[PDB]
Amino acid sequence: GLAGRGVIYIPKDCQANRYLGTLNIRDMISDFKGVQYEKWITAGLVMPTFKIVIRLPANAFTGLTWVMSFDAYNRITSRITASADPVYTLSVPHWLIHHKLGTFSCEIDYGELCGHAMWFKSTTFESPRLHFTCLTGNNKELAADWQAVVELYAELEEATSFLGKPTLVFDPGVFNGKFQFLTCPPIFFDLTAVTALRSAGLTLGQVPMVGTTKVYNLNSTLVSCVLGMGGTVRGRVHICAPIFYSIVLWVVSEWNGTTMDWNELFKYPGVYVEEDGSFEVKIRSPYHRTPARLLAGQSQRDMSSLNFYAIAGPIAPSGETAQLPIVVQIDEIVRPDLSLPSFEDDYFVWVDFSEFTLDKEEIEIGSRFFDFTSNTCRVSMGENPFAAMIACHGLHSGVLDLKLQWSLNTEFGKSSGSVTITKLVGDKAMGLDGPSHVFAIQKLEGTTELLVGNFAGANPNTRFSLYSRWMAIKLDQAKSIKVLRVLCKPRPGFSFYGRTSFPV
Amino acid sequence: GLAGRGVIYIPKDCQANRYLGTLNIRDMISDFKGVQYEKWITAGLVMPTFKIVIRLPANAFTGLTWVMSFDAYNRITSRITASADPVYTLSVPHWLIHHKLGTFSCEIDYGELCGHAMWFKSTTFESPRLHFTCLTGNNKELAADWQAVVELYAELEEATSFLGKPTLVFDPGVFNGKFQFLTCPPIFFDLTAVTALRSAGLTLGQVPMVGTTKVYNLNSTLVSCVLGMGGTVRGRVHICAPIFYSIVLWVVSEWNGTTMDWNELFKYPGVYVEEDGSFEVKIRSPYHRTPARLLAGQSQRDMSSLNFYAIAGPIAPSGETAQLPIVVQIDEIVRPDLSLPSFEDDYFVWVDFSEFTLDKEEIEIGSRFFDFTSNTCRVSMGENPFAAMIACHGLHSGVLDLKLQWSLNTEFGKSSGSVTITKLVGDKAMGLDGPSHVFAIQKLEGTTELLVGNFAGANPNTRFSLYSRWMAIKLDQAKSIKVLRVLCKPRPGFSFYGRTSFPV
Amino acid sequence: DLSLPSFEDDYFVWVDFSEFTLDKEEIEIGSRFFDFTSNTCRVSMGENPFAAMIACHGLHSGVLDLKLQWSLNTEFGKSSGSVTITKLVGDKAMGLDGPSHVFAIQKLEGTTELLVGNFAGANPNTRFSLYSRWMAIKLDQAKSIKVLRVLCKPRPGFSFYGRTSFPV
């Protein structure tokens, strides 16, 4: 039944990118309080399937399109409260809300989209939010300020387990070609132009940016798992303007620039788009595939692109001035021609330690896979899809096999000491002794396993304190080491929960 | 499920007649608030079946017995908060709570015991209460103050109708001989006495008193519907003392005094009582029946009584000092020898008006059957079982046939004017005109019907304002009237809801 | 979930006449159910659903049973005269004589039927002139009456035609 509610205020002038507000999902249920809220207190833990309903007067004369963004791990909130770049709002699970369609509804399986069960008395990891932003603005301001109502419907029952089912399990050789929640920021057409071109890059492994901020997300991370891709792009086009705006588009794929000859343009295999609908366009390339990521100094336009040509319009009655926005969603690469996977089932670099200033150095790892920092030596972190996947999920869990390699800074004959791997259960202070391991420095390499997890079952992508196994690397002659490299190779079944994003 | 809760506080010295507290049933549910409370808000109206549970550490060493009294219409609250005489606490539906039995439970069909459905937002008539009082005290104080927990369990669902099913329907010729909630105040035996007698009167139509206060109740009212009764009294006896107290009773019926000869006493048909249990004793009388009520200067002992003779004990270890209490419950008269009904299916006196001081007099009746007052004339109200039944229920509804009779104060030849019966729907100010009726004073009598009820379906036994038909008697030559008598005769199906009591 | 009906199948108040200024008073009813006016006495009209229904339809037709009740203004022993119910077919001038009826004032009550209708079949809610039965109440000692009350009870099948409204 109705479990919780909230209100979004809409400014009489709702421009593209306006932050409209954030609702806190747990507060919606607890402020309402709530037949469902009271069932929750008894259950303790709930893994709801929500129906979210946004009540909203339908109107075809505004052109307004909003985005509801499900931010279960509070990753974009900080960055959108002034203004919400679409790159942020579309980097987490989200839904387009078209004003022409009025009242909106969708399902959120909290087991999938989030991954951990909700505790009645307090937030466990971070507090789950719904963000409401404006993707395409109104063509002219409306008569007055107004509001929309957000409602949560659910039948809460006691959760049997803490963890959901994993959204993703790590596998280098597996990127199907199907996507979810891959929405391109809006493309705009001026009505003061008789024709026009808008390119969308198809180099989908590229990490999106907002100014100097990189926004890592699961989709670009997935694509990066492959060297390149060919095939047909299946997607949907939304025309986000008032009924009295209209346009006709020729949508086609081109390689390295665009032709300047209108007649050549129409000898290509494209499709016409007059209205909201799906489309399929073949990725066009001399190699039949476009590369997954760019090299130094190449552009996305240098490769295969999805080109939107306005061949008639846009038109509108006078005196409208608003641009006509097109929102593109990419659903999958059908009939895919994939390259080799970019990585094999092999080790990859986690971290290099170098330039040691003290002979005694102790690197605490504990039960986490994360970015190191040191005041006493130089840390160089690895960048690879696995690390990105860690960053683009709320929770993860698994086992990493480690290979340690090191070279000497001093003469081999003078060398002494060891790379020691301390393995405990608990912490340095009260822990139990596991398979700790002393590698004489002359071995020049060593191996160990690392449990990434804890008694609860999964790690957040932050610092946390939960009883688990505990690991540390101890150097006693660190100045004799030119470099200590740590490689890892996830054991099968390394699991990720709740897709999200990670701005840096 | 658990719907509401509350706490009663017990003093280390809990003496007979201590008032322990009152819980407000609706507050218990709303303060808890409550999966059931929230279901209630949606239903609007509920007609619950409650399971009441009193949690209570069982103990055989105290002698403590409490009474929970269900006072849905707030009739005894005022009178028990200083001291709670058992006459008040047992005059409404109630339950004995024996300390030796520990945790206590019972069902309350709110449809029967109360009669009207509960409105989520506010009290409709009066606010339903549970009173907790001590019936028999502890033999010696306990070690410390303590508490008991009261719990309401219910599965609230929306009520289809406002009114329950009627507890009682008026019928002069119908008193079965079965009782509910007929509990006699505790009888006490001193342990400083080798034998003893305690009489319980069997003149059950007599109205119980607390000081100068009459406590009208349904049971005595029922018995008054008959001229007398013979047969066998079936009941239960509770011995309300610690396991280390014990007694043996000879229980027998006697007429007009008691025999002084122990040998004669045991030639009577009595029963022995050694412990908690049921009993059957024949009502002994020269006429085989004892009268339902007393005449002037008669005494309850002059008739048939139920006598409790302590023939062995009570005994207790030294140095106990408490008396041993016996609580008697009367369940029915089995194999009943009833007298004629005291009333036939006929009219009875509602009210006499006399001694008018003004020629213009207007008596407003409206839609109620109630006690009149006047500053301008003498009101003499009738006392009969019907009036008592009105007083001993929370709600009632039905139709009364009225006969009006009057005699002249002036000479007949000089007489003028009328007894006018105004009949409206609504009120004097905005009402519609019904079967109003002008009786020329010389008619000397007249008849009319009166609806006792309203749009909601029933009347409380208080002043209330609910749209209904409206009646008034209008005199224009009142000084010419020596007496205006109004008789009434309830039409079949006159209904009463929720048995209760009425102290005056 | 309905309440009781507000009215039962019973009489209700049509009109009270009171405060008579002349001993000779004659109230013409004819064949209509309507609001009375008098220059010589006080008219108090009843308000009930039946009267509203009469007002909220274009035409109506039926039969009303009447109960007349009255109380005296003078001393009973001095009373004389009558409440007379004149019943004609036609009009006062050329009519035929029906069940006219003389109630000695001392009876203090009387009954009669009234046809609400006419040869055409129904009455408008206005004044009209259509041949029908004709009724009048005749007082000869009206100053001796404190109040004359007229109750009516429609016989089954009292009919209304054409729903409408009535602003006042």
Author numbering:
A (entry chain CA), B (entry chain BB): 1 to 504
C (entry chain BC): 337 to 504
The study reports:
The B and C domains clustered at the 3-fold axis. The structural variability of CP subunits within a capsid was very low. GFLV and TRSV are both transmitted by Xiphinema nematodes.
of a GFLV-F13 particle is viewed down a viral 2-fold axis. 3-fold and 2-fold symmetry axes is 155, 137 and 123 Å. ligand-binding pocket at the surface of the GFLV-F13 capsid. be recognized by compounds of the nematode feeding apparatus. axes may constitute a ligand recognition site. surface of the protein capsid which may constitute a binding site for the vector.
